[PDB]
Write a protein that binds this DNA or RNA. Structure first.
Ligand SMILES: [Zn+2]
Ligand SMILES: [Zn+2]
Ligand SMILES: [Zn+2]
Lengths: 85, 196, 559, 49, 159, 65, 43, 114, 133, 168, 266, 141
RNA sequence: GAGG
DNA sequence: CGATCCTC
């Protein structure tokens, strides 16, 4: 109530530009506020550049709740979502 | 601005040595773009220049009066009589290298006007400051330290970009933002908040 | 509208804009004083502490500094006053409102904002002088002009807010516009003009220049290309050194009028692995064209590579041209003694045709075709002969102009001006119009009190026989002013009317967006389209491509 | 070089901008548009100088 | 008029056709006239197309019209944008204008309608008819100073 | 508003030439072109400097205080 | 100044247009761009 | 208002040196020298003389932005020839040329009568 | 390696098609009645007149950054007067056995037709043009 | 023939001939089965919609009808061999490029197309010159154009200035 | 001697016309540049206005004061105030001039550069004397006065270079031309019918052999021989504008050579 | 003496006007091609002549050099701008206590003038300088 | 009131 | 009942 199962998920397996922008935002904001970093910073200091590395190496522990117009939703982990662009 | 409806700003200033130079060693006080000519079709600008070049050389005033028999040819004769190419073109050298330019420059005097409204009278910037009495919004005007307008048109551009949070921030953290107490029953701002 | 849909905002700046051939496409030149006024609230982490403490110590008046330090219990410390202003022992969690520094994302806008391209995220670059500087190839999306225009700057105050600008609003991300499924930026002005002059078959450069041109390319591999000429003098062509600015893996093909793989007139365009084979580079190659270098590079290499391309092209072209020069004089509007004599006779024959049709009209021998007045038909005819004469006189002019003619050069590169311009400046201005019709009888039965009653002659009703070079007569002068006025009036009308149209469209479509089911929908959840665009495809990722089965003969389809 | 033609009201220079109007006592007939019952109308805006 | 038509060889050819151009409209009557091609009859009055041929034909004619004004100018706008506007006017069942008479009277949220025109009187009938505001609209979240379901906020971020 | 010292474009001093110029026109009864050349103002940037100078200081001096 | 002291105003069929009858009476060129365009005249 | 002091064109700042040698990445035996508080008077003059050097593979210079009084000079040389020495010889050659000019102009001026 | 093509051509026409220092040359083999040539020559460095007899050669010899001549002891494969370098961009087969090659020498174009070109003219980024007498 | 479609197939081909250094003198290593089924299987992978149901399947089918026309016209057996002269290596790469570039070409949920359309029409409308027309020489070719016409259209004007019927 | 060669065509107190042969265009230009911008001069750089009852503004006047040419002969024996160890200025780094003027007559009282008066101790250096070249010995009309009009000010003249302010320019226009026949084809002449008939030839053509039509373009030829004319504003004599121009350039090349030495340690 | 007379648009309706005194009425019976195209007298039934056609203009436009060689909108724009220009507005400026005054340090009389400027006192109270202008693609700034 |  | 953006 409401939801959709892990099986039968019609929404794009590809992460949106808006999904990427918000995910990089939330993470960059956490990093900038002394939250722990899930990757080896190779001389990196910029919170956003760090969030980008964490994205590239798929260690961002977030879930995009995708809503459909009926009110139902599909949960997609950052790790499962394909990041082409 | 020139006397031909051709307003323009200083892009940069170069000292004499960087400026392109003539064989007599004359240097422009100003450099206007060739592209400012075709579309505008302000041919009189080109004529004014030619005439003014002849005027300064001959120590006579130029007749720029309208309905007359003063021809571009007529002027071009008088300029050649002075040992300059008849159409205002001049061999110029690059100020950096001293190398001749492959292109000859249309040079000579032209009346220009210093117009009011100068950068320093226009520059504004506000990172928080005075707030309007009623709206609790940034004030209006540079000479009051007012906030620049992020109108509905700008609001539109941000929706198009899908920048939901930037839009929330421009309209809350910057400018406005307020905390009100609501009743879960009536839903009105009635709640007489005795904070602390 | 003025307090909720829009409002006056903090973290905003404004000033006169100026062009910068030395700035990057995605940069913006911000005056040092402005940089010193606008701030970012940065939280102190061990990742920045060292830089932050330094900036706090630089203070509000030395540039890479700050004003205000915010600690736990949210109390602000004013770095311009405060006794402890030069003391400040920073802590993690504290906020430092630092000055706006190089490479910060900033919203940069030109009003009116009729486009998502009118608002764009720029890379800050702190500079001397009081103007906002911008790359010339960013002029068009903003509809900017350096005649005295002013532009707006907004500063993100949140980490996610600066992420939105850099990841959605960024200038290179806007290069390929979904408005017309084609680029919205391109090589303009001196660069567009010079790039033609540079790419001519005749254009050659030697070591000295070549080396400087090469070094001017930031990306530069460091390898001197082998000169196209290795005879008594090594000599590189313009095509050669410009292909340095073109990345590898870039392929471009065109074919213009006479283009035949041996391109006799140096027309068309062929670029292989990012090296120009033949074809002079102009607006069709390097402008904001549908199948141009820019549409290609963005799609092929990427937006940030394409954004670097504008700079690299600019840097070589602007350099070569600075050393070549380029002007425009009164001599560029002059046409041959023989040519003028011929324009004159072209106009006299239009005057005879107009006289004869008149003489015929007056004899009651002129018979209008179905649907129109005998007068309406006469008028339609006269106007035609006169319009024909202007085109014919102007074509006579355009043909006389040498390849060395500076206006012809600007038209050829496509950097400025059209045929009409050449025609009106060199040969004949033409017929004036007020409300579609030619100059009317404002005085009883005459256009001016210098004419006699009932005069339908070219001269009498607004036909400017003279070129702006030759000069216009008083009568011609007035009629041109009458036509001119009407144009200024509707210019004022268009701007007011179209602005209102734009607002209405915006209000009506506001809440329409593609949902997680590819369904185009409003706030009510109502369906407008089942697949956006009838194909659920994004406009920026779309180009006019030939369907090879629809055309040609059945025999040609078979083969 | 001052040309005059202006006033000084509270030490402030005031120009009276020449105001345009149609002259009075002028007889003018107007063809009236499709819906109206009155085909043509003849007006005069009679005044006293 | 000049026309592109498939020849017997397969390829397209210029075959110029005689076409009649009119001052005035009566689609209903003219299309039933003998000697014409009632399959091809057209009018710039798209409202008449909507009335005689139906909503869908009206929609098509509406696009053709919007399209022709952009193309007249030399300007080109991608299909989908004009398609979207045309569909918007269309989905109602008939023709809804890009005016306060058209879209502003729609079943949409009270706060999002008052942002355009008739500001007060829209909010007045909102109180009178006792309207409930969805608050899923752009302008409504703009008013409320909240993150709207626009691009970035069109989904939630969870742990 | 007095002879500018030095030609803007080139730098050639022009401040010492104004009075000599007026005398050449008045006393010597010469034309502007020969007068400008007599003062050694060869380049047109220098000629325009003096030829187009309007001497408003004379008007300003006419004021009583 | 001279110009301001030779200015015309027209409050409220084709007022903005440079009429033929204006010849020698009102300047054909001199009008403001937009809003009061063709309503503000110069003798 | 936002204008630098005109002395900033010829006067070195605090923590600012004239030459700044930097080893080039893109090519072997190449170096990149940043000349602080200098322009086309020196950039062009040195580059042109550096090209007269037969052991010089590359020599170019640029003024990245006109606001700032600085130029970058790129030098590539034959294996065994260090660029700093090419710039050393470049400079001396110039100084020698100038001293000869100085002398010749001085010898000429002394013959002239006016 | 070495040479890939070497022949003597006879200049029919010389054309400065809206150019000052460039000319398109039309020539044909003195030996082969089918062998064609249409090339762009720099008439400022090497001027060409009507009915001139020129020796055309395509090689690939005497890749990395270009080092200035430095003739100190430098020996290049030329007893020639005019030398160019370009890239191959098309290999048009003009029916039955006839083949045409396309070379752009920095935008100065070349088209050489005949038959025996075969296993000598590759799609190579190479090709040095050498012309003598 | 010329229509706005995603994935510039021509470029992908020219890219393949450079990357794989294709020689128009060596016979290809492909088959009819490789080319024919190859293109066919590519079509089943150009996803826009994903619902395993009939409505969505047909919705999907229709969405790509036109692109597949272009794809089939371009990747036909005769053309892939006599024109492009592709190898199996270069061919499979082109298949993977189309698939990926197609998926890159798709619209993103969240794209505020309402404002996008409004602005995409509204802006070029501001750029409109000559309230009249260019058919101004002929007095019978006079039809409401530009900004007044656009106003007529949007307001859904009951009494348009130039009602005109075109009879075939 | 060896390298560059000079031939003085004409010479005067304020003008040299010479041919600079056996040179690099980089050198000739860099020399042209350094003569315009970098030879040190002495010009008024500070004005303290005690009294001004003139029609002219404080700064208007102070601006023109900086433009008055002052003797700069013995300039290298005066320090830049920035290097002087004094607090502000002194006789080791600056010259102090005085301007006192009063409208005594009913007739307009003129104020000239002759009226500036050195108050400073020159320590026997030829420096600070206003440059006077007019026949009447007045030189430069600073100002004009009425009857009650007065002007009392003090000038601190300092060492500087044109690169900081044009007032410090010892020279005016520098004529510069190489290859008057365009044998080098360094320019492409714009024409209508005949470039030759349309473009006036330089006086410099007399000094060179004409191209000769029946000769192919000399591709290898380089620009060496430069027809120059250096004009002095007055502060420094003409010979000195070129000699100091050479010496300054020569000096700034030596500073690079010395910079290489300094960074060659640790 | 009745050599000149005052006309208003109403009376203008009843009169025929020659544009030039000579060039509109000597007689009839080779030309300068550079010179513009001027029609014919044709009508000779004249009652008046134009004092000077340039008088159709007013103060602002009277400042333009050769507007008869310019596009019509450019003359309108220039007319708007000359009112944004700087220069000696009055000789007494030193004595007025006015809000905002902008005075050019060294105003110059333009090298190219119109006969009407003589009456507009332009060369006595100028608004600009005769700058040596080059039309060129230089640094491209 | 002035600026695009 | 509407009628382009900016600040003075
Ligand atoms: Zn309650
Ligand atoms: Zn001068
Ligand atoms: Zn001292």
């Amino acid at each position: 109530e409401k939801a959709i199962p892990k099986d039968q998920r019609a929404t794009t397996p590809y992460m949106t530009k808006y999904e990427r922008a918000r995910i990089l935002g939330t993470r960059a904001l956490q990093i900038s506020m002394n939250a722990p970093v899930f990757v080896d910073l190779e001389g990196e200091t910029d919170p956003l550049r760090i969030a980008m590395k964490e994205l590239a190496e798929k260690k961002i522990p977030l879930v995009i709740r995708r809503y459909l117009p009926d009110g139902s939703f599909e949960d997609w982990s950052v790790e499962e979502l394909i990041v082409d662009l | 601005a020139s006397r031909h409806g051709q307003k323009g700003t200083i892009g940069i200033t170069y000292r004499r040595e960087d400026m392109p130079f003539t064989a007599e060693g004359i240097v422009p006080d100003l450099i206007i773009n060739p592209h400012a000519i075709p579309s505008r079709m302000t041919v009189a600008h080109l004529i004014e220049c030619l005439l003014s070049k002849v005027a300064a050389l001959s120590g006579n005033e130029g007749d720029a009066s309208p309905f007359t028999d003063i021809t571009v040819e007529g002027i071009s004769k008088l300029l050649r009589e002075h040992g300059y190419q008849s159409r205002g073109f001049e061999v110029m050298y690059n100020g950096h290298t001293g190398k001749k330019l492959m292109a000859q420059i249309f040079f000579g005097p032209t009346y220009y006007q210093r117009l009011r409204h100068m950068v320093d009278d226009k520059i504004h910037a506000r990172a928080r400051g005075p707030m309007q009495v009623l709206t609790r919004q940034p004030v209006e005007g540079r000479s009051r330290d007012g906030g620049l307008r992020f109108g509905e048109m700008e609001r539109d551009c941000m929706i198009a970009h899908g920048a939901a949070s930037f839009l929330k921030e421009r309209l809350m953290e910057a400018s406005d933002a307020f905390r009100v107490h609501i009743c879960g029953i009536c839903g009105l701002m009635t709640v007489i908040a005795k904070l602390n | 509208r003025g307090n909720l849909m829009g409002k006056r905002v903090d973290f905003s700046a404004r000033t006169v804009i100026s062009g910068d051939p030395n700035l990057e496409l995605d940069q913006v030149g911000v005056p040092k004083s402005i940089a010193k006024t606008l701030t970012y609230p940065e939280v102190v982490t061990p990742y920045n502490i060292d830089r932050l403490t330094q900036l706090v110590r630089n203070g509000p008046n030395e540039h890479p500094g700050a004003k205000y330090v915010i600690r736990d219990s949210g109390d602000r410390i004013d770095l311009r006053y405060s006794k402890r202003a030069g003391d400040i022992q920073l802590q993690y969690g504290w906020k430092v409102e630092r000055h706006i520094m190089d490479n910060d994302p900033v919203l940069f806008n030109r009003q009116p904002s009729l486009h998502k391209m009118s608002m764009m995220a720029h890379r800050v670059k702190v500079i001397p002088y009081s103007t906002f500087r911008l790359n010339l190839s960013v002029t068009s999306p903003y509809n900017a002009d350096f005649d005295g225009d002013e532009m707006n700057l907004h500063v993100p105050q949140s980490e996610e807010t600066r992420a939105e600008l850099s990841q959605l609003c960024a200038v290179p991300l806007q290069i390929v516009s979904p408005q017309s499924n084609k680029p919205c930026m391109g090589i303009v002005q001196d660069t567009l003009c010079g790039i033609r002059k540079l790419t001519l078959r005749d254009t050659f450069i030697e070591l000295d220049q070549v080396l400087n041109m090469l070094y001017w390319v930031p990306d530069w591999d460091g390898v001197i290309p082998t000169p196209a000429i290795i005879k008594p003098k090594p000599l590189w062509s313009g095509k050669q050194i410009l292909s340095v600015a073109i990345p590898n893996g870039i392929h471009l093909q065109r074919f213009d009028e006479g283009t035949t793989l041996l391109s006799p007139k140096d027309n068309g365009m062929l670029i292989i692995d990012g090296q120009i084979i033949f074809g002079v580079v102009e607006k069709k190659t390097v402008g904001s064209s549908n199948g141009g270098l820019i549409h290609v590079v963005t799609r092929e290499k990427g937006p940030q590579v394409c954004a670097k391309l504008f700079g690299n092209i600019q840097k070589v072209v602007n350099f070569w041209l600075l050393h070549n020069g380029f002007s425009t004089g009164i001599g560029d509007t002059i046409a041959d003694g023989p040519t003028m004599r011929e324009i004159t006779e072209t106009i006299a024959e239009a005057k005879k045709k107009v006289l004869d049709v008149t003489k015929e009209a007056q004899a009651n021998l002129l018979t209008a075709k179905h649907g129109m007045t005998l007068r309406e038909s006469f008028e339609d005819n006269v106007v035609r002969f006169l319009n024909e004469a202007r085109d014919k006189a102007g074509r006579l002019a355009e043909v006389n102009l040498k390849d060395l003619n500076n206006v012809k050069q600007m038209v050829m590169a496509g950097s400025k001006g059209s045929f009409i311009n050449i025609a009106q400046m060199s040969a004949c201005v033409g017929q004036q119009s007020v409300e579609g019709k030619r100059i009317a009888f404002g005085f009883v039965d005459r256009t001016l009190p210098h004419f006699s009653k009932d005069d339908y002659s070219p001269e009498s009703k607004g036909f400017v026989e003279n070129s702006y070079l030759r000069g216009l007569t008083p009568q011609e002068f007035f009629f041109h002013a009458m036509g001119g006025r009407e144009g200024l009036i509707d210019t004022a009308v268009k701007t007011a009317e179209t602005g209102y149209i734009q607002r209405r469209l915006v209000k009506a479509l506001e809440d329409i967006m593609v949902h997680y089911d590819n369904t185009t929908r409003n706030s009510l959840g109502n369906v407008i389209q089942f697949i956006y665009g009838e194909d659920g495809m994004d406009a920026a990722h779309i180009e006019k491509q030939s369907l090879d089965t629809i055309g040609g003969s059945d025999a040609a389809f078979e083969k | 070089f001052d040309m005059g033609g202006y006033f000084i009201i509270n030490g402030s220079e005031k120009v009276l901008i020449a105001q345009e109007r149609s002259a009075g006592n002028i007889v003018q007939v107007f063809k009236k548009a499709a819906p109206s019952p009155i085909s043509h109308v003849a007006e005069i805006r009679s005044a006293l100088e | 008029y000049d026309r592109k038509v498939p020849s017997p060889t397969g390829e397209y050819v210029k075959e110029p056709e005689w076409v009649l151009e009119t001052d005035g409209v009566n689609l209903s009557e003219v299309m039933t006239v003998p000697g014409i091609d009632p399959t091809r009859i057209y009018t710039n009055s798209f409202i008449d197309i909507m009335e005689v041929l139906g909503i869908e034909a009206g929609r098509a004619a509406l696009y053709k019209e919007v399209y022709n004004v952009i193309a007249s100018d030399g300007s080109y706008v991608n299909y989908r944008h004009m398609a979207l506007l045309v569909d918007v006017m269309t989905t109602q069942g008939g023709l809804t204008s890009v005016t306060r008479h058209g879209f502003n009277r729609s079943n949409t949220g009270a706060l999002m309608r008052c942002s355009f025109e008739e500001t007060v009187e829209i909010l007045f009938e909102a109180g009178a008819s006792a309207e409930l505001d969805d608050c899923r609209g752009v302008s409504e979240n703009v008013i409320l100073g909240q993150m709207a379901p626009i691009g970035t906020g069109a989904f939630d971020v969870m742990i | 508003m007095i002879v500018p010292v030095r030609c803007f474009s080139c730098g050639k001093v022009v401040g010492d030439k104004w009075e000599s110029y007026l005398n050449l026109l008045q006393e010597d009864e010469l034309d502007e072109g020969t007068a400008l050349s007599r003062l050694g103002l060869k380049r047109y940037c220098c000629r325009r400097m003096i030829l187009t100078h309007v001497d408003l200081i004379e008007k300003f001096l006419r004021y009583n205080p | 100044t001279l110009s301001h002291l030779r200015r015309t105003n027209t409050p409220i069929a084709k007022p903005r247009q440079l009429h033929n009858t204006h010849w020698g009476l009102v300047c054909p060129a001199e009008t403001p761009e937009g809003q009061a365009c063709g309503l503000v005249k110069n003798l | 208002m936002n204008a630098p002091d005109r002395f900033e064109l010829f006067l070195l700042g605090e923590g600012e040196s004239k030459l700044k040698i930097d080893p080039d990445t893109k090519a072997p035996n190449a170096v990149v020298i940043t000349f602080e508080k200098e322009d086309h008077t020196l950039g062009n003059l040195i580059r042109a003389e550096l090209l007269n050097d037969r052991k010089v593979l590359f020599a170019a210079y640029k003024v990245e932005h006109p606001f700032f009084a600085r130029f970058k000079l790129r030098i590539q040389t034959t294996e065994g020839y260090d660029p700093k020495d090419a710039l050393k010889n470049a400079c001396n050659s110039i100084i020698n040329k100038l001293g000869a000019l100085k002398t010749n102009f001085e010898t000429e001026w002394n013959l002239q009568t006016l | 390696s070495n040479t890939l093509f070497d022949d003597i051509f006879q200049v029919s026409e010389v054309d400065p098609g809206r150019y000052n220092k460039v000319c398109r040359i039309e020539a044909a083999s003195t030996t082969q009645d089918q062998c064609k040539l249409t090339l762009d020559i720099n008439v400022e460095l090497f001027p060409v007149a009507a009915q001139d007899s020129l020796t055309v050669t395509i090689a690939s010899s005497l890749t990395r950054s270009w080092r200035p001549p430095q003739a100190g002891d430098r020996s290049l494969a030329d007893d020639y007067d005019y030398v160019m370098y370009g890239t191959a961009y098309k290999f048009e087969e003009v029916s039955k056995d006839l083949i045409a090659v396309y070379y752009s020498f920095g935008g100065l174009l070349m088209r050489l037709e005949g038959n025996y070109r075969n296993l000598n003219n590759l799609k190579q980024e190479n090709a040095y043009l050498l012309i003598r007498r | 023939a010329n229509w706005p479609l995603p994935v510039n197939i021509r470029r992908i081909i020219q890219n393949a001939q450079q990357t794989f250094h294709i020689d128009h003198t060596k016979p290809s290593d492909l088959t009819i089965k490789d080319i024919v089924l190859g293109v066919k299987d590519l079509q089943e992978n150009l996803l826009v919609l994903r619902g395993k149901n009939e409505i969505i399947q047909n919705a999907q089918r229709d969405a790509v009808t036109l692109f597949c026309c272009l794809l089939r016209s371009r990747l036909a057996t005769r053309r892939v061999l006599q024109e492009y002269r592709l190898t199996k290596q270069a061919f499979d790469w082109v298949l993977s490029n189309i698939e990926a570039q197609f998926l890159r070409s798709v619209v993103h949920p969240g794209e505020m197309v309402g404002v996008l359309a409004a602005q995409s029409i509204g802006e070029p409308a501001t750029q409109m010159t000559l309230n009249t027309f260019h058919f101004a020489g002929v007095a019978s070719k006079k039809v409401t154009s530009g900004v007044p016409r656009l106003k007529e259209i949007l307001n859904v004007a009951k009494n348009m200035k130039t009602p005109s019927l075109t009879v075939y | 001697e060896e390298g560059p060669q000079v031939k003085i065509r004409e010479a005067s107190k304020d003008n040299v016309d010479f041919i600079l042969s056996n040179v690099d265009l980089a050198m000739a230009n860099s020399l042209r540049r350094v003569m315009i911008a970098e030879i040190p001069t002495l010009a008024i750089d500070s004005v303290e206005v005690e009294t001004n009852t003139t029609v002219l503004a404080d700064e208007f006047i102070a601006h023109r004061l900086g433009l008055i040419p002052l003797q700069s002969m013995d300039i290298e024996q005066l320090e830049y105030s920035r290097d002087c160890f004094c607090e502000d200025h002194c006789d080791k780094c600056s010259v102090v001039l005085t301007l006192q003027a009063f409208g005594e007559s009913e007739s307009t009282t003129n104020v000239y550069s002759k009226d500036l008066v050195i108050v400073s101790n020159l320590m026997g250096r030829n420096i600070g004397h206003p440059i006077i070249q007019d026949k009447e010995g007045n030189g430069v009309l600073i100002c004009k006065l009425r009857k009650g009009q007065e002007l009392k000010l003090t000038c601190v003249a300092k060492k500087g270079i044109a690169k900081e302010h044009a007032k410090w320019g010892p020279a005016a226009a520098i004529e510069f031309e190489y290859d008057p026949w365009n044998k080098l084809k360094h320019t492409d002449y714009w024409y209508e019918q005949d470039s030759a008939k349309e473009w006036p030839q330089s006086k410099n053509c007399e000094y060179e052999d004409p191209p000769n039509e029946g000769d192919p373009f000399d591709y290898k030829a380089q620009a060496d021989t430069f027809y120059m004319n250096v004009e002095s504003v007055g502060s420094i004599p003409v010979d000195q504008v070129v000699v100091r121009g050479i010496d300054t350039l020569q000096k700034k090349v030596a500073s690079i050579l010395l910079a290489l030495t300094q960074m060659d340690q640790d | 003496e009745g050599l000149v007379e005052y006309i208003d648009a109403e009376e203008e309706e009843s009169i025929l006007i020659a544009m030039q005194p000579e060039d509109l009425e000597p007689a009839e019976a080779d030309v300068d091609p550079a010179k513009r195209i001027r029609v014919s007298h044709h009508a000779t039934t004249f009652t008046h002549c134009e004092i000077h056609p340039s008088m159709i203009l007013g103060v602002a436009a009277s400042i333009i050099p050769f507007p008869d060689h310019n596009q019509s909108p450019r003359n309108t724009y220039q007319s708007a701008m000359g009112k944004q220009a700087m220069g000696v507005f009055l000789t007494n400026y030193n004595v007025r206590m006015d809000t905002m005054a902008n005075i050019l340090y060294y105003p110059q009389k333009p090298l190219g003038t119109t006969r009407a400027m003589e009456y507009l006192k332009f060369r006595e109270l100028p608004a600009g300088q005769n700058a040596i202008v080059a039309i060129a693609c230089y640094s491209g700034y």
